Structure 1
Amino acid sequence: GLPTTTLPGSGQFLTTDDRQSPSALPNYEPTPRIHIPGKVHNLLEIIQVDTLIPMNNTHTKDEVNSYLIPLNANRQNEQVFGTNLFIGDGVFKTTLLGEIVQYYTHWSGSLRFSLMYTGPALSSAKLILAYTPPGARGPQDRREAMLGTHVVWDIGLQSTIVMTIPWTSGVQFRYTDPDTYTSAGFLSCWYQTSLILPPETTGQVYLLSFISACPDFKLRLMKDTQTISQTVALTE
């Protein structure tokens, strides 16, 4: 008989501990694995695939239309859309990125925001996208917007433009859940010159917008998502 002493914590059950256990089914042989395409190893692998952002959130019931950012022909100087960058809330929240970020407490890294244009091929347009780093207000006019991170996008044969929100930060991690101290800025978009439709054409054209994370990205300290809950256990 070897002398032992038990410490504080004996008998506790910590849902996060990782130890060995007896197998209830001694000697059982599991089914062989066969090959299946698509294996995922890290959630970091999947948040780099871009998905659509319901940017046009202004509706009243969920609709395919809140994915469409409208553009008006012949407007000059004006603003196309605006949003803050709380990736865990608001427009971002239902996107795959938003949806995964919510399983973690802290995030750090660059984001990739792209816009794909869908107007007739014989039209043309020049837009400016601007990222405003924390510390200033959402820009109120392009002059204000153009003094921060921006890209003049020229609509052409190449249909999409990929803007990166480079990680601009004092503190090396921000909370996913809306924190002030930890806030990331604003994203706005304005006409640089203006949309022009060809003859025989009319109305609004739309941009689709996507979001995905750069390879830069870090997420840490897992927790429970506000995105799902329940009141009684389900049954069959």
Structure 2
Amino acid sequence: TGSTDSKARYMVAYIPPGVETPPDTPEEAAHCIHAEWDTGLNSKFTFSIPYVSAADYAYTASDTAETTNVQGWVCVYQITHGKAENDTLLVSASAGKDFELRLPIDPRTQ
């Protein structure tokens, strides 16, 4: 969302489960599946969080007994920037081509 004279370089990484806490450094996260992009004429960048798990399906809800997230984390980093202080990066989500939901449920309190 920055002005024409604001530049930056970002990185997004998918940290799979198996580590206790996500890395707060691009250097450590580099070993994971990741993508880096910079600022320019095209303002948007899209990345696919892959489905990598033990079972073929994963629960949409989370159990109270879960400490660490069963499916891992996503970490967004800022490699650097040039005069981009206070400038923004909007982030949104959408279903991918093979996203699938099964087994209808009526869970909300009524």
Provide the C-alpha distance between the structure 1 equivalents of 2:91 and 2:77, rounded to a whole number of angstroms.
15
2:10 aligns to what? 127
1:151 match: 35
CA distance in 2, matches of 1:174, 1:182: 12
Compared CA separation, residues 182 and 122, structure 1 to 2 (3 A): closer
Give, in angstroms, the shift of residue 217 of structure 1. Answer: 1.2
Counterpart of 2:2 in structure 1: which amino acid? G
The aligned length equals 106
Aligned to 1:218: 100
Tell me the percent identity: 34
Larger gyration radius, structure 1 or structure 2: 1
Deviations 1:126-185 (A, max 9, x none): 111111112123123222211111101111111011011111112111111115598111
The TM-score with structure 1 as length reference comes to 0.42
The aligned residue for residue 195 of structure 1 is: 81
- Measure, in 1, the Cα distance between the counterparts of 2:59 and 2:42: 36
Q: SS of the residue aligned with 1:163?
A: coil
Which consecutive residues of structure 2, in runs of 5 or more, have no partner in the other structure? none
Q: 2:72 aligns with which of 170, 185, 195?
A: 185
4+ residue runs over 2 A deviation: 179-182
Is contact 1:174-1:182 (8 Å) kept?
no
More helix by share: 1
Cα RMSD (Å): 2.0
- Render the CA deviation track for 1:45-79: whole Å, top value 9, x for unaligned: xxxxxxxxxxxxxxxxxxxxxxxxxxxxxxxxxxx
Measure, in 1, the Cα distance between the counterparts of 2:4 and 2:107.
Answer: 42
* 1:187–1:141 CA distance, 2 compared to 1 (3 A): same
Give the alignment's TM-score, normalised by structure 2. Answer: 0.84
